[PDB]
Design a protein around this ligand. Structure first.
Ligand SMILES: [Zn+2]
Ligand SMILES: [Zn+2]
Length: 454
RNA sequence: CGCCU
């Protein structure tokens, strides 16, 4: 039930067929990249990086292998960016380095983030900003964009129409029914699409092993308020620099309890800068201040929103825990790790927590408080979703093998036929011919290591 | 289940 060990190169793509090829995100979560082919032309959905398990000198980032598209960069009609996370957009500078006039298609915030990253590489891309509801033709690919709710604002699924049929790519999504910005995952859109006919659905598998439903983000507010209410000294909150809604809730609590907020960390400052700038983050006047002024403030009036929720040794939280930061942890400080614990980072995270605890901090985290909810649909949501989309072929994407198999089983339960559910690996080539999806070959899709110069 | 600088 896996791809055949020796799959040759794929045959010619039949006239009228579509060819889908995950170059990343399958078997190992990250460096997500999917290549769509129709009539010799290529559409790329996401191009991200993957963060290495260790691996110290000479290995900063891991990219998708561009081998199967490098000899045909001229065929690429565009790169669609479903949302602004690094394992979806982090690879773009290394792809554009090889052909800089490939157009980036994406939401406003998505584009602003990727443009910020590209600036550091001296690259200015051609872009096409889209919003939910926009429909646009990109070479042979007719792209309609659909709102999805998630850990970052402004994320899109995309429905791609060709004469091979309609392919829906969900990007990353969950289904919060009470999102901070009122922006729901557009089930109306999906239902309409489903009545037109969804021939191949590529769906987020990240949380498919998890039963039930993701608690709504707004529940976190309660916990934050409890923590804030009982915190007699400074509060330090760590989160991913892109989690705008999370941070929104931290400012909300800060305001409620008469505290001032300062952002610490390059990424955090940059991103909250962009989010605030474009209206995604709503900040009441007088709340946010420079970190330098925090010295002048009483402890009980101070909230630091900083960086390094995954124990990244160069980030704020870690250096604080290692007594190597301008900010010095003291007995009585409250630290909240308002984040996930990505598998593999347990050593680093726990080391940070132990350091913090050692210096006298009370540390709130997902292990002792409900201060984080997943960004991805659980088994419950996925069932809701499959019952609305009713895909005719299903490809689980974005997960380790256990995740994909889970997602596959859910699809099965909703009535997707087993022979129409295809589990792929990086480099496995799926052809949508005559409305059926079949594994037809595989291409080179190993790992590629980069130091910023590759 | 996405870094960080
Ligand atoms: Zn994401
Ligand atoms: Zn992702």
């Amino acid at each position: 039930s896996h791809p055949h060990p020796e799959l040759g190169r794929p045959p010619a793509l039949p006239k009228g067929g579509l060819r889908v090829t995950p170059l990343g995100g399958l078997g190992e979560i990250g460096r997500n990249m999917t290549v769509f082919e129709y009539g010799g032309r290529l559409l790329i959905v996401d191009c991200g990086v993957l963060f290495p398990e260790e691996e110290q000198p000479g290995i900063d980032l891991i990219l998708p292998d561009f081998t199967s598209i490098r000899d045909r960069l001229d065929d690429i009609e565009g790169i669609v960016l479903t949302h602004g996370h690094e394992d979806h957009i982090g690879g773009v500078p290394f792809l554009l380095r090889e052909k800089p006039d490939i157009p980036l298609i994406g939401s406003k915030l998505t584009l602003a983030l990727i443009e910020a990253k590209l600036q550091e590489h001296r690259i200015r891309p051609y872009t096409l900003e889209v919003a939910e509801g926009h429909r646009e033709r990109v070479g042979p690919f007719d792209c309609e964009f659909v709102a999805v709710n998630h850990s970052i604002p402004d994320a899109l699924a995309v429905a791609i129409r060709t004469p091979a049929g309609m392919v829906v790519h969900t990007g990353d999504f969950k289904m919060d029914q009470l999102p901070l910005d009122g922006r729901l995952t557009d089930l109306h859109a999906f239902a309409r699409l489903s009545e037109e006919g969804i021939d191949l659905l590529l769906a987020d598998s990240t949380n498919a092993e998890v039963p039930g439903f993701v608690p709504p983000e707004r529940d976190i507010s309660n916990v934050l308020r409890q923590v804030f209410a009982n915190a007699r000294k400074r509060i330090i909150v760590a989160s991913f620099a892109s989690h705008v809604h999370r941070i929104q809730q931290i400012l909300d609590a800060a305001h409620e309890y008469g505290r001032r907020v300062a952002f610490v960390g390059r990424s955090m400052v940059r991103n909250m800068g962009i989010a605030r700038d474009l209206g995604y983050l709503k900040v009441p006047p007088g709340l946010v201040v420079d970190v330098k002024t925090l010295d002048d403030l009483p402890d009980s009036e101070v909230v630091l929103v900083c960086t390094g929720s995954q124990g990244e040794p160069m980030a704020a939280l870690s250096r604080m825990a290692n007594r190597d930061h301008q900010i010095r942890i003291v007995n009585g400080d409250t630290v909240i790790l308002a984040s996930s614990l990505i598998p593999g980072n347990e050593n680093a995270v726990y080391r940070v927590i132990n350091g913090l605890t050692r210096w006298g901090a009370n540390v709130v985290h997902k292990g002792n408080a409900k201060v984080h909810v997943s960004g991805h649909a659980s088994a419950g949501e996925l069932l809701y979703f499959y019952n609305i989309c009713r895909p005719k072929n299903l490809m689980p994407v974005h997960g380790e093998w256990r995740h994909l198999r889970a997602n596959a089983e859910l699809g099965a339960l909703t009535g997707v036929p087993h022979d129409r559910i295809v589990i792929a690996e990086d480099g496995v080539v799926v052809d949508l011919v005559e409305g059926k999806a079949k594994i037809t070959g595989k291409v080179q899709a190993g790992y590629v290591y980069v130091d910023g110069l590759s």
